[PDB]
Each structure stands twice: as C-alpha cells, then as structure tokens.
Amino acid sequence: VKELLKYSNETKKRNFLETVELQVGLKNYDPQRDKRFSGSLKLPNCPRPNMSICIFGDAFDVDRAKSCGVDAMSVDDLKKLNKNKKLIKKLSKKYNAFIASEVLIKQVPRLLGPQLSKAGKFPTPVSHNDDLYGKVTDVRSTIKFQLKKVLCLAVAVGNVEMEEDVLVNQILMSVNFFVSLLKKNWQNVGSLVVKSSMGPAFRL
Amino acid sequence: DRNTAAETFKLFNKYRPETAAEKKERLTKEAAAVAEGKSKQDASPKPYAVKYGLNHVVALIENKKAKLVLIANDVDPIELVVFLPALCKKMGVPYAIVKGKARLGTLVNQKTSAVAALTEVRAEDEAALAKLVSTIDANFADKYDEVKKHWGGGILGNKAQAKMDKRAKNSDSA
Amino acid sequence: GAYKYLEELQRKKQSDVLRFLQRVRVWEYRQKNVIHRAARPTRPDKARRLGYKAKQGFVIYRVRVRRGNRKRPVPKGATYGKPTNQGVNELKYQRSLRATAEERVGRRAANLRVLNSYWVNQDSTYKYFEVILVDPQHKAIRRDARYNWICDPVHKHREARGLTATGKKSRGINKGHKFNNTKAGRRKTWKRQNTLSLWRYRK
RNA sequence: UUGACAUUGUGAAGAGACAUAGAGGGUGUAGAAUAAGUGGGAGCUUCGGCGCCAGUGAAAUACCACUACCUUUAUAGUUUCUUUACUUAUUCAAUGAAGCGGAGCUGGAAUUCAUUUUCCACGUUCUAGCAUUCAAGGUCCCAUUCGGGGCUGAUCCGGGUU
RNA sequence: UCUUUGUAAAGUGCCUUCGAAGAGUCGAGUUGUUUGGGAAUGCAGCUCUAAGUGGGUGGUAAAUUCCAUCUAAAGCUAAAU
RNA sequence: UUGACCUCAAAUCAGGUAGGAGUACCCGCUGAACUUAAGCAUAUCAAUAAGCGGAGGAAAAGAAACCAACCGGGAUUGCCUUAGUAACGGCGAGUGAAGCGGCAAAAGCUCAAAUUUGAAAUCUGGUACCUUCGGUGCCCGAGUUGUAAUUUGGAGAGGGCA
C-alpha cells in the first residue's frame, strides 16, 4: 500500500533541512522504444498547485490581449520582438494562441532549448485566456518521456500537508496508465522511486 | 555426540510408552473402576509417554504441540525424513538428528522408530529438558542456514587421495 | 500427516536432491538382478495409494525392463511381403514396459497376484519399476473384506489380461468419443458390428 | 557409417552478464567551467565556499536522485569454447579376487651449506635334486601329563582384488 | 424358537470453521502402428515435462476472451450378452 | 564383550501355492498372404488365419476427466434404429462408426490423501479347550517407514445448540 511509506505524505517533512519550497518528484518506470509518438504524451490538470514561480510571455493579438490585465503574470505584445530573440531569459514558460502563428518561427533559437517555448506537446498555445489562467499559475506537472526509460515529474511540495495531497498522486497515476499506448509492458506501475529534492528516496 | 545422547536417553528412559503388562494392568484397574466408581476413564491418570510414529510426529509439529523431535541418521528411503529439519525449523520446534533408529527403536519397545517426540513433560525434569533444548539448539537449529549452504560429500578414496596429494605436492612445492 | 510431503517431493524430480537419490539408486538397482525382491517400498506414498497396506502378505518386487523399440524377428530383415510391411527397426510394441514388468513378475511369483505398479527409475538402457503383488492364499487376505476380491479365481493373472493399472490404458478403455474402437473391448466392438444379424421375420 | 538428445557427473583455463558497492571515466561552439541527459528548485552550512540572479548555449550548477555510459568482481551461481585434470556411472581384461596404496626399517648412490635437503635398493643364477603337517627357533601364559594357548620369527596403517 | 446381546451403532435440523481428492503421470514434439478421425482417434518407443479459482473435454491448426460439462493419472460389483 | 537393527541367504524347516489338459465362447499380444483393385507398389483381404500369454460359467465393461449444447440427459452391456449416413480413400477399388429414440436388464460403491495420541484399539502363526467351513484364552511374531474405526466427491470432518 502507499500508506506505509510517505510517497506524498507527512512522513518526509523533517528529512530535508532547507526551509524553502522543496517539491516532491515522482519517477515512473516503463520500458518503451526510441520513437517519439509512443508513450504518455499528455499534461493533465494538477488540482493542487506545485507552488512554483512562473511568468508568462503572452505575445497575443487583438482579440486576446485584454484578459491579461486581471489574472495573469506579464502583459506582452507582438511588437516587442527585439528582446525575446537576443538577450532576455527572465521566464519559466510562456503561453500563446492560434491567432498569430507567423511569429513562432522567430523565437526558436533561444526559447526552444531550456523549455521556454512550445513545439508539439505542452498546452502552451491555448486560445482561452479567461479560464486557463486559473490552472497555470497553480503550477502543473511535467510529463516528458526521455530516450530509453525514465519519466521524471513533480507532484507537490513536501511541506504541504497530507490533506491537499491525497487526490493528487491518485489522479496522476491514471494519466500515464490510461493514455498509455500498446508499446508498454505488464505492470506499468513497475518501479516508483520517489524523492523530493534533498532527502532519501521512498519507493513502493 | 555421546554426552547429549546419554542425557537424552536418560530423559527418554524416564518416559516410555505402556507395555503389554502395564496395559493389561490398567485394563483390570479401569474394569474395576468403571464397574464400581463409574469414572469415565478418569480413574486412571493422564499419561506422559513419548509421542512417536512419523505421521503422528508430523501432525504434532504442524499443530505446534511438540516440545522436542529426534530423527535418525538412517532410513534408506531418505525422503521420509529430509523434510523434518525444514518443518522443525519452520515451526520453531527444536530438533536433533540422533544416530541410529535402533536406539530410537529400543526406547519405544519397537524395532525401528525413525522419529521420537516429547510434547508433554512432567514438572520434575523441566530444567533438564530446557538444558537439552539449549544444547541441541546450539548444535542443530542455529547452524541450519550454514549447513543448508554446505555441500556434503566429494571425499576421494585414499589411494586417489594419496596420488592427488603427491601430485599436488610435487607440482607446487618440492 | 507426512505422505503429502513425500507426494510433493516425488513430484519434484530433477531437483538436486532427487537427482542425487536417483543416481545412487539407479546404480544400486543396476547392480542387482533383473527381477528381485524389494524388502520395503521405496515410495510408501505411491505404493500406498495403489493399495499397499503394510501387513503380512503384500510383497513388493523390483524389476528391470529393457528399454526401447521392438526389433522385429524374421531374420535378416526380410518380412516376405508387401512393402507396406517391410519394417524392422522402428516398430513399437503396443504394450507398455510397465506392463512387461508386471507380466514377468507375474510369471515368476505365480502364487502371487499383481495389484498395480509404479515407476521408480530409468537410465537409457533400462526402466526400473516396482510391482505391488499380493499373496492371495494368505489368511490375512482371505479374510479382511477390503482385499479378499483378489482371492476369487477370475483375477488369476490380472497382469496378463490387461486388467491392471497400465493394462486398461494400453487397451484404450475409457469412456468417451475418443475411444470408439476400444471402449467395451476392441474385438467385441469389432465383432458386434461385423456380425450380420438376421431375424426370423427378416426386416 | 555420421550427427543431435539422453545415460552424463566433478576440478582447473578463455569470453559473454546477471545477485551484490563503488571508486572513477565519458573535451563538437558558447557559457567562472569536462553541463553523457532528465526532475526539483532560491538557498544550504557555525563559517568559508558555491548557488539564485547575470551571461551563455541544443542543454544553468550550490544540494539530493534515476536512466545511463567505459572500467573496476574483492564477494554467488550459470553459460559456448582449452583438452586439461578427476573416479564414482558406463566399458574391457585376469585371478581357486594373494600380497595394492602410503609410511617406516636397515644399507647405498648422494652433497652436506645444518642435519639430513635427496633417490635407489630392502634373502633364490654353474647343476632336469629338495621345499607340504597353525614352522622350527626365541618369549609369556596354563598348572604341568600326554599337551594346548598368545606374541615374534613374517614392520605398521587404509579393508579400493588388481 | 433361545438369547436381547445396547448405557453400543446409525439416521436427520440450524450455525461456525473447514474441506486434504491419485505424477515421468497429464500435456507436448517426434516416430511406428491404427482408426471413420480428416493441421494427427487410440496405443506404444524416445525426448521435454506440468498446474493448482487447477486439469480434461467441447472432432479443423493458432492467438485472444467468455460459456457449458465433467473430474483423470488408484479399486470392486450381479442380469440383460 | 554381549545384545539389538537393517539387509541377504540356507534348511527333505512349519504350512501353503503356481505349472498341465480342454480351449466352442471371453481378455490381450504378435501377425501374414492368396484375394479385390479386370496390371501393380498406398489401399483391400484384415486390425483377419496361423503363432503365443490368461480366465470363467460366462469373461469383459462399469458407476462417468461421459453424451450434449437441449426445456438438457445420466454407470456398463444387448437388440431395433440412426446408417451404408457423417467421415476415410491411387477420393479408385473399397472401408465405415457415434450421440439422440424404442425396448431388454437394472445396483451400487471402495481405498490413498485428516493425530485414535488419556492409550494400535489391528492381524498371521503356535498351543490349550470347544457348541471345531470356526470360537475363546495364552505365548512368540508382523506392524507404528504405520494396522483398526471414522471419510471418499453425491459429500464429508471438527466444534456449538434443539
């Protein structure tokens, strides 16, 4: 059972000595192939925030650059173009739309590398900016499958009590298992090495 | 060894099953008693004889009623008794592999026994029982994993041994 | 109870202990005669579920049978017939070797009666079985109603008429649709359907 | 006749990789800097120190981990090969299964580098004779009868007939 | 018709805890034979070798998923013939 | 040194038993060929004849690891029928079952696997006596590497209550 160990719970709270927001990290284990279309290619809604700081480079257009002055992080435009291609790196993830898809060929050599842009997997160019901003400032997870076999993500903070973090590790177990393709093996819950950022690893 | 065997067989000479004359005597006793005192087989006392027989002993082990189990270094269909070390180690009952089913025969008034077991014991010899349990557990039950790792046999014959050792001496040393 | 342990141990054959015991015993049995007396059942479980009750009268014999196909006679290979029937080397002898063991000890201890038998051991040259014979004239078995049916004289040589354990297999007698050539007996079910039945008032 | 599997086991070599840890290794640009990749992330340690930031590049670090990449087996059992070594299976042969194997005992080749480090011997060759009675002798018994017994003569040890 | 052998044996209602069931056998590959049995009906030689909500059968091979039926690898028994 | 155990033998040991005959029916093994195919090599004759092993008044089979796929039947054997059918087959010549239905006869069950453990409660043999195809007492043996009762798949066991 996931109750004897911590795995999201109260048991690992005094093991780390840093009194800063240290988030818990869950690692899935499933042998896949080297291809890019297989695996769990989905980023769901995380119901409790991961408690991270992230600012959004909303480079919007006429119909969508008005809902950023109420509940957002930064208000940008498409005219400010000579900053996000040469010097500035003060960002964590952006958020775009479908109305302007000809500016995307310009911010690729600087922001596609450290995951500051969008290519094909994360819901960054979503049009709706009046309801999806109650989901991105409550910081989500990071489901990104690597080359051979690992899936490193983040669930919540270890200092958060076991009451908010009781339906979050359960709703995340139902995403890498049910959007699963048929290039996955038996017992897809095979090995879950869960360590936050500083202490020991607690596995099932 | 001979010391613990001597102590163990003094203990079992104190506890023998009923022979024919004893059974006929207690038959006359209870034939008097049930006809006169009408005690439902309780005018006779509770027995304290040694439990024995192989299916009997295995049942007493599986129900954890045994205090001590003895086993022969014998019977030629060996699959009869190779599981009793594992049963006694699995159920925590102490056990010792005594030499000869002949001696186990003579303590039980039979020819061959191949097992013997104490389940009850009177209050006179609890300490001697516990001392024997301690010595046996020092010998047999606690070395069980290590002996389970050892591979017995393989000792060459002495002509082959002497030829081996001379060839090994003249090849590495002089 | 401790025949369940012997039962399950004997089910684990190629494990290291049983292949040690199998090697010592194939050596020992190969150094004795072809048919000789077993003083005690080497497998009390497997003898015991075939009808052994250890009292006066039940006898185990232990028996080596030569192992393989049946090189036909008719010397220098010539069968004198159709090339349908011109084989020698590959013909396979419809009775099992377990049946041959039972039949040979039936002839040698002719006073006794075979009951069943069981495998014990094999190398490439030989199979070794043990037969579980009963002495029917002994007074411990002429009484004791669970085993006195052997005393009736219709069971003289059950081993030679296929009436034992391995006989009724080798006759193919079971129920089923897979035994229609031999279900009540092969030749009775042959003869009842090559017989032209004629009535008086011919239908 | 030739092959494969079975009968068919046990030691000692050479490579393929697994229980089981860890030291280290892994230098195309840029970037304090050898970032094989990823996750958390603005801070930790008494302090120092690094880190956030800054800047960079496809990859931003202090701090804890996973997959990995080339070594390192020191710990345990399996592989196909070395043809090596084994005796217990199987095989062959001989004997009224008679003297095997090891150690010692004298001599003696042997030269001593401390004292023996060594190996060979260890009852019969002029003769168509003889060789048999628990063996004569020696030594201790027994109860001296007339005789019997034990040890040695014929070194012990392991019962593997060789 | 003489004993009444019996404080023996057996039957049945409810509840609980259980519930042991047959291996070099089953099954399989091959080989010979056989059968109406046809990607193999039975038997037998060899080689491999099981399982336990399992095993077999369900007359076309196989993967996958239900369903029904029985319980093998021990044994006895008249009459219709 | 005596006493046991295992195992293996020998006795004109005690007491038993197997052998051969018949073999028409029954259970197996082994196994042709003439023949048919208007030739002949698979086929057919034929799972036959001859050979060999083994029984009885019948043997054998038998209480389902079955038949079905139904609204389900229920051990075995036999007859009538399915049926010269499905199926096999140089798809030639030929070979060729079974379930369902109607009757005949109807019959069920037993071991292994569960410690009786406040009691091997079991049995052969020898002897004494007798209401001597057997019964009772006693004594040696067999046997707890396990005999009796209990249970056998449909149930059944242990407890508890009426």
Side-chain angles (χ1 to χ4, degrees), chain C residues 41-133:
Chain C
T42 53
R43 291 169 64 193
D45 49 352
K46 187 69 176 173
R48 184 173 166 84
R49 65 180 54 89
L50 294 173
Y52 190 87
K53 312 302 287 184
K55 61 182 174 182
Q56 294 195 357
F58 287 88
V59 176
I60 305 296
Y61 268 84
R62 188 182 296 117
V63 44
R64 297 156 54 198
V65 290
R66 184 62 64 93
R67 166 179 162 86
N69 287 319
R70 182 183 185 267
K71 180 176 181 174
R72 185 189 284 167
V74 313
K76 287 182 279 188
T79 301
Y80 292 156
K82 302 286 182 66
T84 297
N85 296 314
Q86 204 178 356
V88 168
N89 281 321
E90 287 174 346
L91 284 92
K92 294 190 166 75
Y93 182 60
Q94 306 294 319
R95 285 174 68 88
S96 56
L97 274 71
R98 181 178 171 183
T100 296
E102 296 179 356
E103 189 176 2
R104 291 185 182 182
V105 300
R107 281 202 298 273
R108 193 167 182 270
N111 51 356
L112 266 58
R113 300 283 176 84
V114 175
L115 187 57
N116 284 317
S117 66
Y118 56 89
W119 186 83
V120 303
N121 203 345
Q122 62 183 359
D123 58 347
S124 77
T125 313
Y126 282 138
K127 287 193 178 186
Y128 307 157
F129 296 90
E130 282 177 347
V131 193
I132 193 163
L133 299 91

Side-chain angles (χ1 to χ4, degrees), chain B residues 8-37 42-173:
Chain B
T8 310
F9 287 166
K10 288 177 71 175
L11 182 58
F12 286 3
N13 197 3
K14 293 181 180 180
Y15 287 159
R16 283 184 179 174
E18 287 180 346
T19 183
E22 291 182 354
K23 188 179 179 182
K24 189 168 75 70
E25 178 180 0
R26 63 174 288 269
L27 279 170
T28 57
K29 290 178 183 290
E30 68 192 3
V34 178
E36 295 296 326
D42 292 333
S44 296
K46 179 182 179 181
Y48 288 100
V50 49
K51 309 291 186 180
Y52 67 106
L54 184 131
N55 301 321
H56 185 193
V57 164
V58 173
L60 292 177
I61 288 170
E62 292 180 354
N63 288 319
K64 289 184 183 294
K65 286 176 67 177
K67 296 291 181 67
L68 197 146
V69 176
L70 294 183
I71 291 167
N73 59 357
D74 279 340
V75 174
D76 200 2
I78 310 171
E79 306 99 353
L80 287 167
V81 81
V82 295
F83 54 88
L84 286 176
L87 268 167
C88 292
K89 191 69 179 178
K90 183 67 176 175
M91 305 305 285
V93 171
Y95 72 101
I97 303 164
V98 74
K99 297 188 75 174
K101 58 182 180 178
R103 305 180 77 184
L104 292 172
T106 62
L107 67 92
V108 81
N109 294 318
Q110 301 302 321
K111 286 187 287 185
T112 62
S113 177
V115 291
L118 285 179
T119 61
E120 290 292 327
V121 59
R122 288 191 294 268
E124 295 178 354
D125 294 327
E126 185 69 29
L129 178 66
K131 186 176 184 292
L132 264 64
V133 166
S134 177
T135 300
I136 285 168
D137 291 334
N139 288 315
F140 288 103
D142 291 335
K143 289 184 181 179
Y144 175 70
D145 295 333
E146 300 296 324
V147 178
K148 185 67 179 177
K149 290 183 288 184
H150 283 288
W151 279 79
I155 304 167
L156 277 70
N158 54 356
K159 296 173 77 174
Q161 186 63 256
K163 183 173 72 68
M164 172 184 170
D165 292 333
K166 295 297 173 64
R167 185 184 61 197
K169 183 179 288 294
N170 293 322
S171 178
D172 291 330
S173 296

Side-chain angles (χ1 to χ4, degrees), chain A residues 2-55:
Chain A
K2 59 100 177 179
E3 193 175 3
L4 294 174
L5 74 159
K6 175 253 179 64
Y7 182 76
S8 182
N9 287 318
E10 195 269 331
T11 305
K12 193 271 299 294
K13 288 175 70 175
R14 66 179 65 88
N15 294 114
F16 58 94
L17 294 175
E18 302 184 355
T19 176
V20 74
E21 293 176 353
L22 295 182
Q23 284 66 231
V24 72
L26 191 147
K27 294 184 290 294
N28 292 111
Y29 183 78
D30 198 356
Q32 298 180 2
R33 297 282 80 79
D34 194 75
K35 279 82 174 175
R36 300 292 184 183
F37 60 93
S38 66
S40 179
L41 197 149
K42 187 177 180 181
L43 182 63
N45 204 170
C46 189
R48 297 295 183 184
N50 204 6
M51 295 176 70
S52 178
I53 181 65
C54 60
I55 188 167

